[PDB]
Curated annotation (Swiss-Prot), chain B:
Belongs to the calcium channel alpha-1 subunit (TC 1.A.1.11) family. Two pore calcium channel subfamily. PANTHER family: TWO PORE CALCIUM CHANNEL PROTEIN 1. Residues 63-90, 150, 210-215, 231-252, 359-395, 411-431 are vacuolar. This is Two pore calcium channel protein 1. Residues 112-128, 170-188, 330-337 are cytoplasmic. CDD domains: EFh. Each of the two internal repeats contains five hydrophobic transmembrane segments (S1, S2, S3, S5, S6) and one positively charged transmembrane segment (S4). S4 segments probably represent the voltage-sensor and are characterized by a series of positively charged amino acids.
Length: 605, 470
């Protein structure tokens, strides 16, 4: 019960207790109102997620301008399968979440102090965002009366919801501070890339001037630069230069050289510059956190006898910082009592310790692992069947109980704390409960059986080699969350733009559609006609198989080359920057894991 | 200046100048006959290169079986534009390059001394390769005459020419030696990748078992694993799961998760393992180089006037090697990186090109001849739908450009499907699978790591220069 002890010691503890708490919470990274607001922090978090999720269910703007047919003909408009809110439902949940937001944003005035509240920038920006949302909601509500407005051309709330979400979750804000560091360096390598495309497409344009390649593909410098930009992604390779190769096999040399330089040099040079600037900005950022950590330690200090008394609390300035950092890096945190040591003859009778050693024994692991292999054999045999399967319900139940027992013995040997502190044990816990629930409810099957397959990953987890890769993966998964969230918020902004600009054109009546590559390649459900559909289309533009099919199709559907600016800017922001950041993160992760085991060896030697 | 003074000093100079030559050539990184051998290096190189390029102009063997129509109707077989040598020319250039190769491979027999030469296994393997070439050339000559043979099923010379070329250039031979060590680590992450595909494809097959995705795309576990393997490359995205998305939009959650894990995690992990194991082998190589340089300098030492006479020649036991080491002394950063990276990368791009040569030779023997205007099946294939028919294996250039197209991983499954359906045998996929495993997941990831290392070296170098000037 750490958090309650901490908050009690902070609010009511004696100065030595307060100091000990301040240092403990430094090691772990009006105070009553702050604690209350922290307890409400779950409510605030869920409200901010619901505030963003409203974008998925709000009815698309183009449905309001009286389409014929109505948007109920989701086949005619190739629309999604999520529902769209009525106006009534939208006004209900928009009102509830805006009211909770106003409460959330202004409640800190009760404890921060107004001079602080207005001196602080993050406050002023959140006040601006909530004001903008209040205005746009009140406008959209007043439009319930036709006297209020005749027409509404555009809507701003879909963007401000995302901004408020970004400003609410600090780790996203610190990721955007990092990114708005490295962006200035990134513009130089982006410029060198552009200048390379310009030159290469000028050479191509001169070289093919009167060939069939010129006359049917490189018809002008602009089309050349565009086709070459696509070919830098290689997505149109070899298709874009087949006419050249038909006219002279030697033409292949120019395109092989262009692809080779583009894919293996420049793409990697951009990656290297992004990786460098990431590493620089991350080291710069973390140094600021270490400095704040010192500021907190200096407060804990300011609040031989003093050293003895602090070490006495530990039994539960430069000297202080050194001692605290040393003991922190040297020693693990204090033990947590079980609920069961209170029973001497139960918990402490040597039969207990003997069973504890047994469950801890290696041969117990050998037994359980062999049983798990047998469970794998059991399920692989069972999936040969689809009433003959009925007896395998017995095997299902038996393995269910076996996992209940294993989990129980695990908590019997590592409590709740050292059990749940291990991510493997957490996965065990979850899959145990879900399958035990399924089986005890049994005693749709084809779908729930995928959980019985999912449990088989334990066979990989046990492997002495792969455990290193799996540990890299398991630490990387939570560590990537804010960068994936940054990408997802950019996708939300881009989808909103797509829904407003391109939504509604992909319908069965638009005869131009059946001229597009979408209708030729059958991609028709990957339209922007609603937010879900745009969101999955944007996943396709991210992995960017066939991505130019959309850029061509919507160029042709809109009739202006400016439609391309959406996909070009999307490529520049997501692929060339943010995803290369994620790549750098994975490389730093694995090499840190290798460095960590190299340190473990060097210190053990 | 330098090279003449060095060889002159080594052959005729005073021993103090001989030491000076040894140290100067160490700074710059019967000996008369070794000097002749070294000066001929250009002729040796050009002979090896001609022997390698011979594969581009040797007539494809399936034409020698006399098809109808003949390979004179190049359009009917979508053939390239390079000449095919006559039997006369092929015999002439094979004999000439064999004679010059025999000369080169025997040339060290004098200056190395027979026991030493034949003791060194690199000579022995070269001799095995050259004897194989001699035997196969003699067989090819006999096969000109009906008395010796009626037919020969398989021709080995196209491979051994590449093997001899790899053995001949030290920068290549050391590149493949470096590469051969990390393979034992590369096979582990390859096992993890295989196990991942197998399990993910099993979940896919059972999840969709009765759906339209199952009833059209994932019809058997085999088809599932194949389609998922292509989807790991992302090259069949979104195509493979459009039926699932038509039946229920929630299907997309599984394929999005599969692609995300495949790309941004596992492939990057394969890059990380290859990168680290390369950096390990590079470190071992450069440590071996430093050790060898020291051993040479120690020999040069073995040969106060002591100092003065050397400081005199320098105008051109550790104590000596340490002396030698002492007496050895916006876009600009990117552009310097790019400039130096090219002559640094030449070994690896060259090795990749040699692997393509082996694969192209296999391609011309196994698949060559299938893509022709009379093949009724061909017009059912994706090759014909996408008008890719010039990208075939009917001659060596065509195969080489097809192999480049696979190396860029553009539409690469078109050929794998089309040639599977042409060859009528699922085993044809092994060509493209093994190619992807060897070139993309290993060698080109190595190239990536080499580029990144070059860039970070350039940033460190300019930071060092700045800090030392500060």
């Amino acid at each position: 019960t750490d958090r309650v002890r901490r908050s009690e010691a902070i609010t009511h503890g004696t100065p030595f207790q307060k100091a000990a708490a301040l240092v403990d919470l430094a090691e772990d990274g009006s105070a009553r109102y702050y604690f209350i607001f922290t307890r409400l922090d779950l409510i605030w978090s869920l409200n901010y997620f619901a505030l963003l999720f409203l974008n998925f269910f709000e009815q698309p703007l183009w449905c309001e301008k009286n389409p014929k047919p109505s948007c109920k003909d989701r086949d005619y408009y190739y629309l999604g399968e999520l529902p769209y809110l009525t106006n009534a439902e939208s006004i209900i949940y928009e009102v509830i979440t805006l009211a909770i937001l106003l409460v959330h944003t202004f409640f800190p005035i009760s404890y921060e102090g107004s001079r602080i509240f207005w001196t602080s920038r993050l406050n002023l920006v959140k006040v601006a965002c909530v004001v903008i949302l209040f205005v746009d909601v009140l406008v959209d509500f007043l439009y319930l009366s036709p006297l209020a407005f005749d027409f509404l051309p555009f809507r701003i709330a879909p963007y401000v919801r995302v901004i408020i979400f970004i400003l609410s979750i600090r780790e996203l804000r610190d990721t955007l501070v990092l990114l708005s560091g490295m962006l200035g360096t990134y513009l130089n390598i982006l410029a060198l890339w552009m200048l390379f495309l310009l030159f290469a497409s000028w050479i191509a344009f001169v070289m093919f001037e009167a060939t069939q390649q010129g006359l049917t593909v490189f018809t002008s410098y602009g089309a050349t630069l565009y086709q070459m930009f696509i070919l830098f992604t290689t997505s149109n390779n070899p298709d874009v230069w087949i006419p050249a190769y038909k006219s002279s096999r030697w033409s292949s040399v120019f395109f092989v050289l262009y692809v080779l330089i583009g894919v293996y040099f420049v793409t990697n040079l951009i990656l290297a510059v992004v990786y460098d600037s990431f590493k620089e900005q991350l080291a710069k950022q973390v140094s600021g956190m270490d400095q704040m950590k010192r500021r907190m330690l200096e407060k804990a200090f300011g609040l031989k006898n003093q050293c003895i008394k602090l070490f006495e609390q530990l039994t539960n300035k430069d000297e202080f910082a050194d001692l605290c950092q040393a003991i922190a890096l040297r020693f693990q945190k204090e033990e947590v009592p079980s609920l069961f040591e209170h029973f001497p003859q139960i918990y402490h009778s040597a039969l207990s310790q003997q069973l504890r050693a047994f469950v801890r024994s290696p041969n117990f692991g050998y037994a359980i692992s062999f049983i798990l292999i047998i469970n794998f054999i059991a399920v692989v045999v069972e999936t040969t069947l689809a009433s003959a399967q009925k007896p395998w319900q017995v095997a299902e139940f038996v393995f269910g109980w076996i996992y209940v027992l294993e989990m129980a013995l695990k908590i019997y040997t590592y409590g709740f704390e050292n059990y749940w502190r291990e991510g493997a044990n957490r996965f065990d816990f979850l899959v145990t409960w879900v399958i035990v629930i399924g089986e005890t409810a049994t005693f749709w099957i084809r779908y729930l059986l995928l959980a019985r397959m999912l449990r088989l990953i334990r066979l990989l987890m046990n492997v002495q080699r792969y455990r290193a890769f799996i540990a890299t993966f398991i630490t990387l998964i939570p560590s990537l969350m804010p960068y994936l969230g940054t990408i997802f918020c950019v996708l939300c902004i881009y989808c909103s733009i797509g829904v407003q600009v391109f939504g509604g054109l992909v319908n069965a009546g638009n005869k131009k559609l059946f001229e597009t590559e979408l209708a030729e390649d059958d991609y028709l459900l990957f339209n922007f006609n609603d937010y879900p559909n745009g969101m999955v289309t944007l996943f396709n533009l991210l992995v960017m198989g066939n991505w130019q099919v959309w850029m061509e199709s919507y160029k042709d559907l809109t009739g202006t080359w400016w439609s391309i600016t959406y996909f070009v800017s999307f490529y520049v922001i997501t692929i060339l920057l943010l995803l290369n950041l994620v790549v750098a993160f994975v490389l730093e992760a694995f090499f840190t894991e290798l460095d960590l085991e190299e340190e473990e060896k060097c210190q053990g030697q």
